[PDB]
Q: What sequence folds into this?
């Protein structure tokens, strides 16, 4: 009803009443899911732009398949073999399930008000990144399906100084 | 530490001294891992053998590729002429969702790490005295023989 993540641009934004009564556990699970989807969206937005200008020269499949040649965007999933996707998914699962490659020194020792404001800002930035990723995916798919549709050319219609 | 798992001829078979220090949680997690590895090994046995036989489900997997058109063995997943990566990724995601939303303990059956009753069972209430121990030994031995055979099959099809 009233917790972190309520800021004045609007105020509550629950039109369809997806929560209504629920419970503390269900609300906490929903908050965790929102934070996870938000962090994933922010990482996706950051990673959708970097390869346009920089490229690591590693040979996914030694001998050939060298990053320097695979397409960027939604066309990489077809080029990358299934083995690499499985390996990286298993790796991130090892990171998530266990404490491996994770350090509790990032929790920090911030005071209460600072922590609350920082959490609200984190949620806001992530909520923006979600729709950012949605728009990126829709533009990429529409352009790839039919070249010339949505005449704005190049990936990343903004930031035209890259090209 | 003498429980289900040293049945048949030899007894405590720990040539490397794995359980030199030992603990209960390590014991339980190792038994659970062995059981899961064996179960997946025998299910993969069923799948691999029934595919090598020649049987195939009807229909198509991709846009115009039947279930019987894909190669048999390692080439199905990796290498030229393989299943489209989108379909394989979708199947992997579905399997992950099923694993994370089906085989968890949501009631409290507990007992052995690997029991997922959640109220549903056929006859695991009337039998009690000793069928549990030898049944668990049977499943463990089948899993171990499975894992050995499936590693052999994979290496044979790789070197073949
Ligand atoms: C979206 C798909 C998905 C998801 C989310 C999960 C999620 C999970 N799986 Mg899982 N699994 C899946 C698909 C999935 N699975 C599929 C398709 C299979 C094959 C049928 C398995 C087989 C499997 C097994 C056998 C086990 C899990 C386990 C687990 C849990 C912990 C995993 C972990 O710690 O990271 C992974 C962490 C690792 C350290 C990875 C270990 C990799 C080993 C050491 C190497 C294997 C050799 C390699 C594959 C081939 C080598 C090639 C050679 C040239 C060197 C977690 C709930 C474990 C579990 O239940 O824990 C109690 C467990 O024992 N899974
Ligand atoms: C082996 C890999 C692995 C494993 C075991 C898990 C395990 C989990 N993930 Mg997860 N995840 C993974 C990879 C993995 N993730 C990857 C690669 C991504 C993409 C970034 C995500 C994105 C993701 C989101 C967005 C959410 C989860 C959630 C969850 C949890 C519940 C899943 C559920 O309800 O059913 C499925 C569980 C702890 C959910 C969660 O914890 O919130 C309830 C959730 O909302 N995951
Ligand atoms: C949704 C996230 C996501 C996904 C799915 C991908 C997927 C992909 N990226 Mg990518 N990338 C991402 C985020 C992501 N990236 C981000 C955030 C950056 C900026 C750093 C990049 C920068 C980048 C480059 C420069 C290149 C790729 C490439 C690729 C492709 C080859 C696989 C690979 O090497 O991945 C690499 C994936 C990463 C490096 C992301 C790792 C991010 C984790 C979270 C960092 C973890 C912390 C780190 C280890 C340091 C810890 C210190 C502590 C303070 C945190 C593949 C399609 C290659 C390619 O050929 O693309 C066409 C390539 O050359 N990516
Ligand atoms: C010493 C450790 C080690 C070793 C020996 C390998 C070996 C290999 N890696 Mg690799 N990798 C490792 C660590 C390692 N990796 C780590 C730590 C990462 C970071 C996540 C990666 C990320 C990575 C990527 C992104 C890619 C590889 C690829 C490859 C293969 C090169 C091409 C090839 O032979 O195709 C032959 C390939 C096969 C015969 C298929 C192998 C299938 C794998 C082994 C199954 C993995 C299952 C998974 C671990 C657990 C189950 C799923 C999980 C959800 C439960 C080769 C088998 C490439 C590849 O697979 O291309 C095909 C590739 O694209 N690796
Ligand atoms: C796929 C690989 C991978 C992934 C997903 C993670 C994921 C994570 N690591 Mg991690 N880590 C990894 C590999 C990975 N690790 C490896 C190989 C090492 C070296 C051994 C570390 C060392 C490490 C440390 C020391 C710490 C983490 C932390 C974290 C957590 C927060 C990361 C963050 O906010 O910064 C991700 C930020 C970015 C991706 C932005 C990149 C900025 C670009 C490059 C600027 C240009 C998160 C759970 C932190 C944590 O858990 O604290 C709470 C922490 O303190 N990791
Ligand atoms: C990966 C699958 C796997 C796993 C996790 C285990 C795990 C275990 N086995 Mg086992 N076993 C397996 C496959 C496996 N087995 C197979 C395929 C066979 C048939 C050859 C056997 C035959 C066998 C016998 C005959 C006995 C065990 C025993 C044991 C337990 C104690 C030994 C130990 O710490 O092993 C840990 C194993 C590993 C860490 C795997 C090695 C990985 C390297 C690094 C590669 C332990 C729970 C003993 C037991 O339970 O006695 C009560 C025992 O007597 N096993
Ligand atoms: C490790 C377990 C495992 C894995 C990874 C697969 C994976 C696959 N099987 Mg398969 N299969 C399995 C177990 C497995 N099956 C079992 C236990 C049986 C016996 C009923 C079969 C019988 C079977 C047939 C008859 C056929 C496949 C086919 C296929 C391929 C495409 C269809 C699909 O997505 O799955 C199909 C999923 C199932 C049939 C579900 C099996 C029952 C589950 C595991 C319980 C795919 C690579 C098709 C193919 O293209 O051949 C290569 C095909 O024609 N499988
Ligand atoms: C102590 C230690 O060890 O580490 C510590 C370090 C530190 C920092 C303290 C810690 C932290 C916190 C972290 C990780 C903070 C990082 C936060 C981060 C990186 C947040 C990204 C936001 C991205 C946004 C909002 C993008 C919007 C994108 C938008 C709005 C777009 O429109 C995208 C766009 O594409 C469109 C749709 C159209 C295109 O034409 C144009 C562009 C490209 C513009 C940790 C976790 O405690 C660990
Ligand atoms: C609702 O959900 O239903 C109920 C349905 C139903 C049916 C009741 C259920 C089930 C019970 C099931 C499925 C039980 C399955 C048991 C199973 C699947 C047991 C496999 C053993 C395989 C072995 C021993 C392989 C050995 C393989 C060996 C020893 C080898 O090395 C073989 C070989 O390999 C090589 C090396 C090379 C070849 O040149 C030569 C040979 C062949 C020498 C379930 C889940 O309860 C679900
Ligand atoms: C997921 C996290 C990603 C972070 C990875 C860490 C990035 C930092 C180092 C990565 C740079 C990889 O590229 C670096 O090694 C490559 C190994 O193939 C080498 O790349 C070069 O050598 C290869 C193998 O000899 C050959 O295919 C080519 O000559 C060329 O690609 C170069 O030495 C350098 O381009
Ligand atoms: C998948 C797992 C195996 C299931 C066995 C057959 C299902 C796969 O094939 C099934 O594809 C569609 C699913 O409704 C249906 O049919 C569809 O695919 C047919 C064969 O490509 C085409 O005529 C059309 O794309 C569509 O009508 C049929 O039912 C069956 O052809």
A:
């Amino acid at each position: 009803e009233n917790e972190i993540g309520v800021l004045p641009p609007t105020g509550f934004f629950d039109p369809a009443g997806l929560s209504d009564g629920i419970s503390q556990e269900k609300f906490d699970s929903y908050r965790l899911a929102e934070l996870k989807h938000g962090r994933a969206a922010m990482l996706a937005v950051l990673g959708y732009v970097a390869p346009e200008t920089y490229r690591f020269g590693y040979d996914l499949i030694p001998g050939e398949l060298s990053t320097n040649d695979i397409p960027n965007g939604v066309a990489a999933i077809k080029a990358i073999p299934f083995g690499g996707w499985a390996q990286m998914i298993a790796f991130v699962g090892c990171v998530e399930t266990y404490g491996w490659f994770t350090s509790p020194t990032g929790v920090l020792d911030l005071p209460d008000d600072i922590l609350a404001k920082r959490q609200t800002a984190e949620l806001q930035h992530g909520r923006l990144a979600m729709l950012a990723f949605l728009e990126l995916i829709r533009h990429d798919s529409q352009n790839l399906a039919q070249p010339g549709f949505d005449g704005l050319d190049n990936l990343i219609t903004g930031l035209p100084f890259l090209y | 530490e003498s429980e289900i798992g040293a049945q048949a001829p030899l007894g405590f078979w720990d040539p490397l001294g794995f359980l030199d220090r030992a603990d209960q949680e390590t014991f339980d997690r190792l038994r659970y891992v062995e059981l899961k590895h064996g179960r997946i090994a025998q299910l993969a046995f069923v799948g691999n053998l029934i595919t090598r036989a020649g049987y195939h489900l009807p229909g198509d997997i991709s846009l115009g590729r039947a279930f019987a058109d894909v190669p048999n063995g390692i080439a199905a997943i990796n290498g030229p002429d393989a299943i489209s990566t989108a379909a394989l990724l979708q199947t992997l995601a579905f399997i992950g969702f099923l694993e994370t939303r089906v085989m968890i303990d949501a009631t409290g059956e507990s007992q052995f790490r690997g029991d997922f009753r959640n109220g549903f069972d056929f006859g695991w209430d009337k039998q009690s005295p000793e069928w549990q121990t030898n049944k668990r030994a049977i499943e463990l031995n089948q899993g171990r023989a499975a894992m050995m055979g499936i590693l052999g099959l994979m290496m044979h099809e790789q070197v073949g």
Notes: The interface with chain A takes residues 77-78, 82, 85-86, 88-89, 92 of chain B (CB under 8 Å).
